[PDB]
Amino acid sequence: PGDNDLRDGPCKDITFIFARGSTEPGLMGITVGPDTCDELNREFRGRVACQGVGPRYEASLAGNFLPRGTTQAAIDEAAELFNLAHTKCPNTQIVGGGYSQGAAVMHGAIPGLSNAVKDQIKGVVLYGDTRNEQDGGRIPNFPTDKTNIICNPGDLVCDGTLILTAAHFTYGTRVRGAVDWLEDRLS
């Protein structure tokens, strides 16, 4: 899988739409985005398309202090990608993902999607979620049993302010658990 597969590749049975954080470069970032994509593909080999939220989402650090914790352009771009999966590949199983500010993108884009698009989203994994406290530990109007907010012990960004600590940068160790959780929701 690549980083622009939903826009530029054939439909796959599983489509991973991921919004990066800690302003890593590229559509997918460098750390947990590619890691999650790679491990999903190893569990469902050849059946996974991977898609980063970009390039209109620029993942700027200052964007964390906008009202929704990211730019409206980023939220719009993510929503367009979920809707594209729905029209281009109506049978694909969508997995949403975000890290840090990328979780704020997912918190903003998913609530407004149609019921039918939400039916296609089988799970959303949010690493180091900067909006955990602000949205009450869930994505608004999206099922909690399809939501996995992963907060490391000591990662204070999940407590309502942007206090960065070393624990915010260790989510590579949580990818195996994230993919185990996704497997219970994917076929």
Author numbering: 13 to 199
What do the authors say?
Cutinases (EC 3.1.1.74) are the smallest member of α/β hydrolase family, capable of catalyzing not only hydrolysis reactions, but also esterification and transesterification reactions. In this paper, a novel cutinase gene (McCut) from M. cinnamomea S168 was cloned and efficiently expressed in P. pastoris. McCut is an α/β hydrolase with a central β-sheet of five parallel strands surrounded by nine α-helices. The cutinase exhibited excellent pH and thermal stability, as well as broad substrate specificity.
The crystal structure of McCut was determined at 1.76 Å resolution in space group P21221. The crystallographic asymmetric unit contains one protein molecule. The side chains of Ser34 and Phe181 extend to the catalytic groove leading to the space steric hindrance. Moreover, two gatekeeper residues, Leu73 and Leu176, in McCut are 7.2 Å apart, whereas the corresponding residues (Leu87 to Val190) of AoCut are separated by 9.2 Å. The overall structure of McCut showed a low B-factor (13.44), indicating high rigidity of the structure. Structure analysis revealed that most of prolines in McCut are located in the flexible loop regions (except Pro46 in α-helix), which may contribute to its excellent thermostability. Hydrophobic aromatic residues Phe52, Tyr145, and Phe174 located close to the catalytic triad are important for the specificity of CLE towards the long-chain substrates, while superimposition of the structures of McCut and CLE showed that there is no hydrophobic aromatic residue in the catalytic groove in McCut. The close distance between the two gatekeeper residues and the space steric hindrance created by Ser34 in McCut may explain its poor degradation ability on PCL in comparison with that of AoCut.
